[PDB]
Coordinates of C-alpha atoms and ligand atoms in Angstrom, one line a residue:
Chain A
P14 CA 13.7 -23.3 5.6
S15 CA 12.6 -19.9 4.3
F16 CA 10.4 -18.4 1.6
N17 CA 10.4 -14.7 0.6
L18 CA 7.6 -13.5 -1.6
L19 CA 7.3 -10.0 -3.0
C20 CA 4.0 -8.4 -4.0
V21 CA 4.1 -5.4 -6.4
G22 CA 1.0 -3.5 -7.4
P23 CA -1.1 -0.4 -6.8
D24 CA -2.8 0.0 -3.5
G25 CA -6.2 -1.6 -3.3
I26 CA -5.5 -4.2 -6.0
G27 CA -5.9 -7.1 -3.6
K28 CA -2.4 -8.0 -2.5
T29 CA -3.1 -8.7 1.2
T30 CA -6.3 -10.6 0.4
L31 CA -4.4 -12.9 -2.0
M32 CA -1.7 -13.5 0.6
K33 CA -4.3 -14.4 3.2
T34 CA -5.9 -16.7 0.7
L35 CA -2.8 -18.5 -0.5
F36 CA -1.5 -19.3 3.0
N37 CA -5.0 -19.9 4.5
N38 CA -4.1 -17.5 7.3
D39 CA -5.7 -14.2 8.2
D40 CA -2.7 -13.0 10.2
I41 CA -0.1 -13.0 7.4
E42 CA 0.5 -9.2 7.8
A43 CA 0.6 -9.1 11.7
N44 CA 4.3 -8.8 12.3
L45 CA 6.0 -5.8 10.6
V46 CA 9.8 -5.8 10.9
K47 CA 11.3 -2.4 11.0
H76 CA 7.7 10.9 -2.7
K77 CA 8.7 7.3 -3.1
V78 CA 7.3 3.8 -2.7
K79 CA 7.3 2.5 0.8
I80 CA 8.3 -1.2 1.5
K81 CA 6.5 -3.2 4.2
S82 CA 8.1 -6.5 5.3
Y83 CA 6.0 -9.0 7.2
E84 CA 7.4 -12.2 8.9
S85 CA 5.2 -15.2 9.5
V86 CA 5.6 -18.9 10.3
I87 CA 3.6 -21.3 8.1
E88 CA 3.7 -25.1 8.1
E89 CA 4.2 -26.6 4.6
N90 CA 4.8 -30.2 3.6
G91 CA 4.5 -31.0 7.3
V92 CA 7.6 -28.9 8.3
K93 CA 8.0 -25.4 9.6
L94 CA 8.6 -22.6 7.1
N95 CA 9.7 -19.0 7.8
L96 CA 7.5 -16.9 5.4
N97 CA 8.4 -13.3 4.6
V98 CA 5.9 -11.3 2.5
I99 CA 7.2 -8.1 1.1
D100 CA 4.7 -5.5 0.1
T101 CA 4.6 -2.0 -1.4
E102 CA 2.6 1.1 -0.6
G103 CA 2.1 3.8 -3.1
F104 CA 3.2 2.0 -6.2
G105 CA 1.6 3.7 -9.2
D106 CA -0.1 6.4 -7.1
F107 CA 2.3 9.3 -7.8
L108 CA 1.8 11.9 -10.5
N109 CA 5.0 10.8 -12.2
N110 CA 5.6 7.1 -11.6
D111 CA 9.2 7.2 -12.9
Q112 CA 12.0 4.8 -12.0
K113 CA 13.0 7.0 -9.0
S114 CA 9.6 6.5 -7.5
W115 CA 9.6 2.7 -7.4
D116 CA 13.4 2.2 -7.2
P117 CA 13.0 1.3 -3.5
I118 CA 11.7 -2.1 -4.7
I119 CA 14.8 -2.8 -6.7
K120 CA 17.0 -1.5 -3.8
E121 CA 15.2 -4.0 -1.6
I122 CA 15.9 -6.9 -3.9
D123 CA 19.5 -5.9 -4.3
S124 CA 19.9 -5.4 -0.6
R125 CA 18.7 -9.0 0.1
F126 CA 21.2 -10.2 -2.4
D127 CA 23.9 -8.0 -0.8
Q128 CA 23.2 -9.4 2.7
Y129 CA 23.6 -13.0 1.4
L130 CA 26.8 -12.1 -0.4
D131 CA 28.3 -10.4 2.7
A132 CA 27.4 -13.5 4.8
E133 CA 28.9 -15.9 2.2
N134 CA 32.1 -13.8 2.1
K135 CA 32.6 -13.6 5.9
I136 CA 35.5 -15.7 7.2
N137 CA 33.5 -16.9 10.3
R138 CA 30.5 -18.0 8.2
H139 CA 27.4 -19.0 10.1
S140 CA 24.3 -20.9 8.8
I141 CA 23.0 -18.1 6.6
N142 CA 19.5 -16.7 7.0
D143 CA 18.3 -16.5 3.4
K144 CA 16.3 -13.4 2.7
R145 CA 16.7 -13.3 -1.0
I146 CA 13.4 -12.8 -2.8
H147 CA 12.2 -16.0 -4.4
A148 CA 9.2 -14.7 -6.5
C149 CA 7.8 -11.3 -7.5
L150 CA 4.1 -11.3 -8.0
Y151 CA 3.1 -8.4 -10.3
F152 CA -0.6 -7.5 -9.9
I153 CA -2.1 -6.3 -13.3
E154 CA -5.3 -4.3 -13.2
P155 CA -8.2 -6.1 -15.0
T156 CA -8.7 -3.4 -17.7
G157 CA -9.2 -6.0 -20.4
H158 CA -6.9 -3.9 -22.7
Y159 CA -3.1 -4.1 -22.4
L160 CA -0.1 -3.8 -20.2
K161 CA 0.5 -0.1 -19.3
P162 CA 3.8 1.7 -19.9
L163 CA 4.5 1.5 -16.1
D164 CA 3.9 -2.2 -16.0
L165 CA 6.4 -2.8 -18.8
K166 CA 9.0 -0.5 -17.3
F167 CA 8.8 -2.0 -13.8
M168 CA 8.8 -5.6 -15.1
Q169 CA 11.8 -4.9 -17.3
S170 CA 13.9 -3.8 -14.4
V171 CA 12.9 -6.8 -12.2
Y172 CA 12.8 -10.0 -14.2
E173 CA 16.6 -10.5 -14.2
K174 CA 16.6 -10.2 -10.4
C175 CA 13.4 -12.1 -9.4
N176 CA 11.3 -15.0 -10.6
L177 CA 8.6 -12.8 -12.2
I178 CA 5.0 -14.1 -11.9
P179 CA 2.4 -11.7 -13.4
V180 CA -1.2 -12.1 -12.4
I181 CA -4.5 -10.5 -13.5
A182 CA -5.9 -9.2 -10.2
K183 CA -9.7 -9.3 -9.4
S184 CA -10.3 -11.4 -12.5
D185 CA -13.9 -12.2 -11.4
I186 CA -15.0 -9.0 -13.2
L187 CA -13.8 -10.4 -16.6
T188 CA -15.8 -12.5 -19.0
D189 CA -14.3 -15.8 -20.1
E190 CA -13.6 -14.2 -23.5
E191 CA -12.0 -11.1 -22.0
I192 CA -9.6 -13.2 -20.0
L193 CA -8.4 -15.2 -23.0
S194 CA -8.0 -12.0 -25.1
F195 CA -6.3 -10.1 -22.3
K196 CA -3.9 -12.9 -21.5
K197 CA -2.9 -13.1 -25.2
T198 CA -2.2 -9.4 -25.4
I199 CA -0.2 -9.4 -22.2
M200 CA 2.0 -12.4 -23.3
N201 CA 2.7 -10.8 -26.7
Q202 CA 3.7 -7.5 -25.0
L203 CA 6.0 -9.4 -22.7
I204 CA 7.6 -11.2 -25.6
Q205 CA 8.1 -8.0 -27.5
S206 CA 9.8 -6.3 -24.5
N207 CA 12.0 -9.4 -23.9
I208 CA 10.6 -9.9 -20.4
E209 CA 11.3 -13.4 -19.2
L210 CA 8.8 -15.0 -16.9
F211 CA 9.3 -17.9 -14.6
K212 CA 8.7 -21.2 -16.4
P213 CA 8.3 -24.5 -14.6
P214 CA 10.4 -27.3 -16.1
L230 CA 0.9 -23.8 -16.1
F231 CA 3.3 -21.7 -18.2
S232 CA 0.8 -21.6 -21.1
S233 CA -1.8 -20.1 -18.7
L234 CA 0.3 -17.1 -17.7
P235 CA -0.6 -14.5 -16.5
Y236 CA -2.8 -16.2 -14.0
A237 CA -6.3 -14.8 -13.7
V238 CA -6.7 -14.9 -9.9
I239 CA -9.2 -14.0 -7.3
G240 CA -8.7 -13.6 -3.5
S241 CA -10.9 -14.3 -0.5
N242 CA -10.2 -15.9 2.9
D243 CA -13.8 -15.5 3.9
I244 CA -16.6 -18.1 3.9
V245 CA -19.8 -17.6 1.9
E246 CA -22.7 -19.8 1.0
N247 CA -23.2 -20.7 -2.7
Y248 CA -26.4 -21.8 -4.5
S249 CA -25.9 -25.5 -3.4
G250 CA -25.9 -24.4 0.2
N251 CA -22.2 -25.2 0.8
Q252 CA -19.8 -23.1 2.8
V253 CA -17.0 -22.1 0.5
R254 CA -14.2 -19.5 0.3
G255 CA -15.2 -16.8 -2.0
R256 CA -17.1 -13.5 -2.7
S257 CA -20.9 -13.2 -2.8
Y258 CA -22.6 -10.7 -5.1
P259 CA -26.2 -10.2 -6.3
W260 CA -25.0 -11.6 -9.7
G261 CA -23.5 -14.7 -8.3
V262 CA -20.9 -16.4 -6.0
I263 CA -17.3 -17.0 -7.1
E264 CA -15.3 -19.7 -5.4
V265 CA -11.6 -19.4 -4.6
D266 CA -11.1 -23.2 -4.6
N267 CA -13.0 -23.8 -7.8
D268 CA -10.8 -24.4 -10.8
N269 CA -13.6 -23.4 -13.2
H270 CA -13.8 -19.9 -11.7
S271 CA -10.2 -18.7 -11.7
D272 CA -6.5 -19.7 -11.8
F273 CA -6.0 -19.4 -8.1
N274 CA -5.1 -23.1 -7.8
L275 CA -2.5 -22.8 -10.6
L276 CA -0.8 -20.0 -8.7
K277 CA -1.1 -22.0 -5.5
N278 CA 0.5 -25.0 -7.2
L279 CA 3.3 -22.7 -8.6
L280 CA 4.2 -20.9 -5.4
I281 CA 3.5 -23.3 -2.6
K282 CA 2.5 -26.8 -3.4
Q283 CA 4.5 -27.9 -6.4
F284 CA 7.3 -25.6 -7.6
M285 CA 8.4 -23.7 -4.5
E286 CA 11.8 -25.4 -4.5
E287 CA 12.3 -24.7 -8.2
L288 CA 11.6 -21.0 -7.4
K289 CA 14.2 -21.1 -4.6
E290 CA 16.7 -22.9 -6.7
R291 CA 16.5 -20.5 -9.6
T292 CA 16.9 -17.6 -7.2
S293 CA 20.0 -19.2 -5.7
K294 CA 21.6 -20.9 -8.7
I295 CA 20.8 -18.4 -11.5
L296 CA 19.6 -15.0 -10.4
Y297 CA 21.8 -14.5 -7.3
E298 CA 24.8 -15.9 -9.2
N299 CA 24.2 -13.5 -12.1
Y300 CA 24.0 -10.6 -9.6
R301 CA 27.1 -11.7 -7.8
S302 CA 29.1 -12.2 -11.0
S303 CA 27.9 -8.8 -12.4
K304 CA 29.3 -7.1 -9.3
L305 CA 32.8 -8.6 -10.0
Chain B
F8 CA -31.2 21.0 -28.6
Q9 CA -27.5 20.3 -27.8
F10 CA -25.9 18.3 -25.0
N11 CA -22.1 17.8 -24.7
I12 CA -20.9 15.1 -22.4
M13 CA -17.3 14.3 -21.5
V14 CA -15.9 11.1 -20.0
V15 CA -12.7 11.3 -17.9
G16 CA -10.8 8.4 -16.6
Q17 CA -8.0 5.9 -17.2
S18 CA -8.2 3.6 -20.2
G19 CA -10.3 0.5 -19.7
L20 CA -12.7 1.7 -16.9
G21 CA -15.7 1.0 -19.2
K22 CA -16.0 4.6 -20.4
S23 CA -17.0 3.9 -24.0
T24 CA -19.2 0.9 -23.0
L25 CA -21.1 3.1 -20.5
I26 CA -21.8 5.8 -23.1
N27 CA -23.1 3.1 -25.5
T28 CA -25.3 1.6 -22.8
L29 CA -26.7 5.0 -21.8
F30 CA -27.9 5.8 -25.4
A31 CA -28.6 2.2 -26.5
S32 CA -26.4 2.3 -29.6
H33 CA -22.8 2.0 -30.5
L34 CA -21.8 5.7 -30.5
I35 CA -18.0 5.4 -29.7
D36 CA -15.2 2.9 -29.7
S37 CA -12.9 2.7 -26.8
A38 CA -10.4 5.5 -27.3
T39 CA -7.4 3.1 -26.9
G40 CA -8.8 -0.4 -27.4
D41 CA -6.5 -3.4 -27.0
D42 CA -3.7 -1.5 -28.8
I43 CA -1.1 0.2 -26.7
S44 CA 0.1 2.1 -29.7
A45 CA -3.3 3.9 -29.8
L46 CA -2.1 5.9 -26.7
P47 CA -1.2 9.5 -27.9
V48 CA 2.4 9.7 -29.2
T49 CA 2.7 13.1 -27.5
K50 CA 2.3 11.2 -24.2
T51 CA -0.3 13.6 -23.0
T52 CA -4.1 13.7 -22.7
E53 CA -5.8 14.3 -26.1
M54 CA -9.4 15.2 -26.7
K55 CA -11.4 12.8 -28.9
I56 CA -14.7 14.4 -30.1
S57 CA -17.5 12.7 -31.9
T58 CA -20.9 14.0 -32.9
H59 CA -24.3 12.2 -32.7
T60 CA -28.0 12.7 -33.3
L61 CA -30.5 10.9 -31.0
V62 CA -34.2 10.9 -30.3
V66 CA -36.7 13.6 -28.3
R67 CA -34.4 15.1 -31.0
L68 CA -31.0 15.6 -29.4
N69 CA -27.6 16.7 -30.9
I70 CA -24.7 15.3 -28.8
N71 CA -21.0 15.8 -28.6
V72 CA -19.2 13.0 -26.8
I73 CA -15.7 14.0 -25.7
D74 CA -13.3 11.3 -24.6
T75 CA -9.9 11.9 -23.0
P76 CA -7.4 9.2 -24.2
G77 CA -4.1 9.4 -22.3
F78 CA -5.5 10.6 -19.0
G79 CA -3.6 8.8 -16.3
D80 CA -2.3 6.2 -18.8
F81 CA 1.3 7.3 -18.9
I82 CA 4.3 7.1 -16.6
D83 CA 4.2 10.9 -16.2
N84 CA 0.7 12.1 -15.6
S85 CA 1.6 15.4 -14.0
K86 CA -0.1 17.4 -16.8
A87 CA -3.0 14.9 -17.2
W88 CA -5.9 17.4 -16.6
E89 CA -4.5 20.5 -18.4
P90 CA -5.7 19.6 -21.9
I91 CA -9.1 18.9 -20.4
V92 CA -9.2 22.2 -18.6
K93 CA -8.0 23.9 -21.8
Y94 CA -10.8 22.3 -23.9
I95 CA -13.6 23.2 -21.5
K96 CA -12.4 26.8 -21.2
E97 CA -12.0 27.1 -25.0
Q98 CA -15.7 26.3 -25.4
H99 CA -16.6 29.1 -23.0
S100 CA -14.2 31.5 -24.8
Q101 CA -15.8 30.6 -28.1
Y102 CA -19.3 31.3 -26.8
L103 CA -18.2 34.6 -25.2
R104 CA -16.6 35.7 -28.5
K105 CA -19.8 34.9 -30.3
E106 CA -22.0 36.7 -27.7
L107 CA -19.9 39.9 -28.0
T108 CA -19.8 40.2 -31.8
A109 CA -21.7 43.2 -33.3
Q110 CA -23.5 41.2 -36.0
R111 CA -24.1 38.3 -33.6
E112 CA -25.5 35.1 -35.0
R113 CA -29.2 34.8 -34.0
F114 CA -28.7 31.3 -32.7
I115 CA -25.2 30.6 -31.2
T116 CA -24.2 27.0 -31.3
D117 CA -23.4 25.7 -27.8
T118 CA -20.2 23.6 -27.6
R119 CA -19.8 24.0 -23.9
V120 CA -19.3 20.8 -21.9
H121 CA -22.6 20.2 -20.0
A122 CA -21.7 17.1 -18.0
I123 CA -18.5 15.3 -17.0
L124 CA -18.7 11.6 -16.1
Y125 CA -15.6 11.2 -13.9
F126 CA -14.7 7.5 -13.6
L127 CA -13.2 6.4 -10.3
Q128 CA -11.4 3.1 -10.0
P129 CA -13.4 0.7 -7.7
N130 CA -10.3 0.1 -5.5
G131 CA -11.9 1.1 -2.2
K132 CA -9.2 3.7 -1.7
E133 CA -9.2 7.5 -1.0
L134 CA -8.8 9.8 -4.0
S135 CA -5.4 9.5 -5.5
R136 CA -3.2 12.5 -6.1
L137 CA -4.2 12.5 -9.8
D138 CA -7.9 12.5 -9.0
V139 CA -7.6 15.3 -6.4
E140 CA -5.7 17.6 -8.9
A141 CA -8.1 16.9 -11.8
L142 CA -11.3 17.1 -9.7
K143 CA -10.3 20.3 -7.9
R144 CA -10.0 22.0 -11.3
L145 CA -12.9 20.3 -13.3
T146 CA -15.5 20.8 -10.6
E147 CA -15.1 24.6 -10.9
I148 CA -15.8 24.8 -14.7
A149 CA -18.2 21.9 -15.4
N150 CA -20.9 19.8 -13.9
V151 CA -18.9 16.8 -12.6
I152 CA -20.8 13.6 -12.0
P153 CA -18.6 11.0 -10.4
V154 CA -19.0 7.3 -11.4
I155 CA -17.5 4.1 -10.1
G156 CA -16.2 2.3 -13.1
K157 CA -16.8 -1.4 -13.4
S158 CA -18.6 -1.2 -10.1
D159 CA -19.4 -4.9 -10.3
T160 CA -15.9 -5.2 -8.7
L161 CA -17.5 -4.5 -5.3
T162 CA -19.8 -6.6 -3.1
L163 CA -22.7 -4.6 -1.8
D164 CA -21.0 -4.1 1.5
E165 CA -17.8 -2.9 -0.2
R166 CA -19.8 -0.6 -2.4
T167 CA -21.5 1.0 0.6
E168 CA -18.1 1.5 2.4
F169 CA -16.5 2.9 -0.8
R170 CA -19.3 5.3 -1.7
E171 CA -19.3 6.6 1.9
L172 CA -15.6 7.1 1.8
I173 CA -15.7 9.0 -1.5
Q174 CA -18.4 11.3 -0.3
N175 CA -16.3 12.2 2.8
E176 CA -13.4 12.9 0.4
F177 CA -15.7 15.2 -1.5
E178 CA -16.4 17.1 1.7
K179 CA -12.8 17.0 2.9
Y180 CA -11.7 18.8 -0.3
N181 CA -14.9 20.9 -0.5
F182 CA -15.5 19.9 -4.2
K183 CA -18.6 21.2 -5.9
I184 CA -20.4 18.0 -7.1
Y185 CA -23.5 17.9 -9.3
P186 CA -26.4 18.2 -8.5
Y187 CA -26.4 21.6 -6.9
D188 CA -29.1 22.8 -4.5
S189 CA -30.4 26.4 -4.7
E190 CA -33.1 28.4 -3.0
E191 CA -35.1 28.5 -6.2
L192 CA -35.9 24.7 -5.7
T193 CA -39.2 23.4 -4.4
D194 CA -39.2 20.9 -1.5
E195 CA -40.1 18.1 -4.0
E196 CA -37.0 19.0 -6.1
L197 CA -34.7 19.1 -3.1
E198 CA -35.7 15.7 -2.0
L199 CA -35.1 14.3 -5.6
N200 CA -31.7 15.9 -5.4
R201 CA -31.0 14.5 -1.9
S202 CA -31.9 10.9 -2.9
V203 CA -29.9 11.0 -6.1
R204 CA -26.9 12.5 -4.3
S205 CA -26.9 9.7 -1.8
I206 CA -25.9 7.2 -4.6
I207 CA -23.2 9.4 -6.2
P208 CA -20.7 8.1 -7.3
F209 CA -23.0 5.9 -9.3
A210 CA -22.2 2.2 -9.1
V211 CA -22.6 1.5 -12.9
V212 CA -22.2 -1.6 -14.9
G213 CA -22.1 -1.3 -18.7
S214 CA -22.9 -3.6 -21.6
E215 CA -23.9 -3.4 -25.2
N216 CA -24.6 -7.1 -25.5
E217 CA -27.8 -9.0 -24.6
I218 CA -27.6 -12.1 -22.5
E219 CA -30.1 -14.8 -21.8
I220 CA -31.2 -15.8 -18.3
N221 CA -34.0 -18.3 -18.0
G222 CA -35.1 -17.6 -21.6
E223 CA -35.5 -13.9 -20.6
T224 CA -33.3 -11.7 -22.7
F225 CA -31.8 -8.5 -21.2
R226 CA -28.5 -6.8 -21.6
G227 CA -25.6 -7.5 -19.3
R228 CA -22.7 -9.8 -18.8
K229 CA -22.5 -13.6 -18.5
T230 CA -19.4 -15.5 -17.3
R231 CA -18.2 -18.8 -15.8
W232 CA -19.8 -17.7 -12.5
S233 CA -21.8 -14.5 -13.0
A234 CA -24.9 -13.1 -14.7
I235 CA -25.5 -9.3 -14.5
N236 CA -28.6 -7.5 -15.5
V237 CA -27.5 -3.9 -16.2
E238 CA -31.2 -2.7 -16.1
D239 CA -31.8 -4.2 -12.6
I240 CA -31.8 -1.5 -10.0
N241 CA -31.1 -4.2 -7.4
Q242 CA -27.8 -5.1 -9.1
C243 CA -26.4 -1.7 -10.1
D244 CA -27.2 2.0 -10.5
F245 CA -27.1 2.1 -14.3
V246 CA -30.9 2.8 -14.5
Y247 CA -30.7 5.7 -12.0
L248 CA -27.7 7.3 -13.9
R249 CA -29.6 7.0 -17.2
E250 CA -32.8 8.7 -15.9
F251 CA -30.7 11.3 -14.1
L252 CA -28.6 12.3 -17.1
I253 CA -31.2 12.0 -19.9
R254 CA -34.6 12.7 -18.3
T255 CA -34.7 14.4 -14.9
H256 CA -31.5 16.6 -14.8
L257 CA -30.7 16.9 -18.5
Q258 CA -32.1 20.5 -18.8
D259 CA -30.7 21.5 -15.4
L260 CA -27.3 20.3 -16.6
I261 CA -27.6 22.5 -19.6
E262 CA -28.9 25.5 -17.6
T263 CA -26.3 25.4 -14.9
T264 CA -23.5 25.2 -17.5
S265 CA -24.8 28.5 -18.7
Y266 CA -25.8 30.4 -15.6
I267 CA -23.1 29.0 -13.2
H268 CA -20.0 27.8 -15.1
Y269 CA -20.1 30.0 -18.2
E270 CA -21.2 33.1 -16.3
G271 CA -18.3 32.7 -13.8
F272 CA -15.9 32.2 -16.7
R273 CA -17.3 35.2 -18.5
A274 CA -17.1 37.5 -15.5
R275 CA -13.5 36.5 -14.9
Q276 CA -12.6 37.1 -18.5
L277 CA -14.2 40.6 -18.6
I278 CA -12.2 41.9 -15.7
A279 CA -8.8 40.4 -16.6
Ligands
GTP401 N1 -13.6 -8.1 -7.1 C1 -12.6 -8.5 -6.3 N2 -12.2 -7.8 -5.2 C2 -11.2 -8.2 -4.4 C3 -10.5 -9.4 -4.7 N3 -9.6 -9.5 -3.7 C4 -9.7 -8.5 -2.8 N4 -10.7 -7.7 -3.3 C5 -11.1 -6.4 -2.6 O1 -10.4 -5.3 -3.0 C6 -10.1 -4.5 -1.9 C7 -8.6 -4.4 -1.7 O2 -8.2 -5.5 -0.9 P1 -6.7 -5.6 -0.3 O3 -6.4 -7.1 -0.1 O4 -6.6 -4.8 1.0 O5 -5.8 -5.0 -1.4 P2 -4.3 -4.4 -1.2 O6 -3.7 -4.6 -2.5 O7 -3.7 -5.2 -0.1 O8 -4.4 -2.8 -0.9 P3 -3.9 -2.1 0.4 O9 -5.1 -1.6 1.1 O10 -3.1 -0.9 -0.1 O11 -2.9 -2.9 1.2 C8 -10.8 -5.1 -0.7 O12 -12.0 -4.6 -0.5 C9 -11.0 -6.6 -1.1 O13 -12.1 -7.1 -0.5 C10 -10.9 -10.1 -5.8 O14 -10.4 -11.2 -6.1 N5 -12.0 -9.7 -6.6
GDP402 N1 -16.8 -5.9 -15.2 C1 -17.1 -5.0 -16.1 N2 -16.5 -5.0 -17.3 C2 -16.8 -4.0 -18.2 C3 -17.8 -3.0 -17.9 N3 -17.9 -2.2 -19.0 C4 -17.1 -2.6 -19.9 N4 -16.4 -3.7 -19.5 C5 -15.4 -4.4 -20.2 O1 -14.2 -3.8 -19.8 C6 -13.3 -3.6 -20.9 C7 -13.0 -2.2 -21.2 O2 -14.2 -1.4 -21.4 P1 -14.3 -0.2 -22.4 O3 -15.7 0.3 -22.5 O4 -13.6 -0.4 -23.7 O5 -13.4 0.9 -21.5 P2 -12.8 2.2 -22.0 O6 -11.4 2.0 -22.6 O7 -12.7 3.1 -20.8 O8 -13.7 2.9 -23.0 C8 -14.0 -4.2 -22.1 O9 -13.6 -5.6 -22.2 C9 -15.5 -4.2 -21.7 O10 -16.2 -5.2 -22.4 C10 -18.5 -3.1 -16.6 O11 -19.3 -2.3 -16.2 N5 -18.1 -4.1 -15.8
MG403 MG1 -2.6 -4.5 1.8

């Protein structure tokens, strides 16, 4: 029972914090299995739906931080996706098959900087090379800094850009709210009612992870973990992996 | 009375909003806006110059740098900026050396650079190191944390201390400069301002209402920011530093440090 989740975004955008928030665990990145982007693979055991689940979070270092962020610089990410497909394919083709350990990536979270403006040329290029190989889920990182109106306007611009570039997002059989405006925090803070809640505390207010009125964190949690995890795994297996296999032959 | 201020930083760091908040008027639009097609077709940094008259009486050029860090390939991002700053010095030197000099030479030299850092808690990126190492030597560079309301107070402290160590690690000249001509009262003013550079700024051209009280800032599903509250952000210190306390020193150091250095290098080449 495995789940492999890829986080793509510039350093400091909030990837690790969001992972600790989603899985309600501060040790998600404790076991690391081992010119260009570097790939960090962390393995973790999380109980979900009452059963045990082997979580693998894949992370990037240095994405977007080079002078020239061309395809060569972030190609390690695509090679990692392909390699996990290639491992499954080799295991499937072995004569002495054994119960296959499934490392294929089941979702790619793409972390968009909260500019309020538009998707950058690098965001479009990367997402165009990935969406046929992973379930692509874009999110607006650190969305607490955005006004309610900026979120609406920014989401609209992003969606139109993705349509124009023919980038196909994951769609549950939620979708109208993509990209999700998310916040991250696995830390407890006191709010104005005196309650202990997960969130971030500033002189200008307290934002609450688990508050549906403050961000789309719960929509993302529903999509990844609580409601549609199996749909993510099935589209990886039945559609994306199968397209990759057939394209090799 | 001329004052030429440049803003440098990736699109959407609040550069145009900050300028408009500093001068309490809508001087400039965002250089790119919500339109990706507004990025320069040349795929390089371009200079965007606008001219303004404020009150005491003050003639201002605002120079924006659309395209800086916005493209896939940013390996020449700072060179049009460097070229523009140096061109202003070259123009002034040309005018100084003419035989029938103009009695009053117009000063188009860049007097201040607001350099916008992303509030990502990280050390200086390769892009910032390359641009800062060149810009700090030809203009008064004032670093600024863009959209600094990203950070809690604790994160702000950690980030500002990290950036100041980066400045020392690379030995950047960062405004304000101390000199032996300064009195003990002026050095202490410099020391206390320097301790909050990069400025943690929040910008806004809109007024919001908080308990009937109207001030300008930002209001959301969870947040209310008063831009003119020194307990919330450093906008008020930046404004006083730029426009009142160090305005004249910014103009003077442009002349007797940056332009004189440029001029001496030109006259021996
Ligand atoms: N404003 C805001 N800040 C956040 C949010 N989530 C995380 N941060 C902060 O942003 C900084 C980056 O957090 P990380 O979780 O380490 O981000 P990262 O993407 O893992 O970056 P790396 O250090 O390269 O691994 C930290 O100071 C976080 O506290 C958020 O939702 N809103
Ligand atoms: N959180 C936050 N948002 C800001 C701030 N200043 C501007 N914004 C918003 O951020 C977006 C981009 O700002 P803008 O001034 O156009 O950035 P520019 O492209 O660098 O000129 C706009 O939606 C602004 O309303 C700020 O200090 N904090
Ligand atoms: Mg991390």
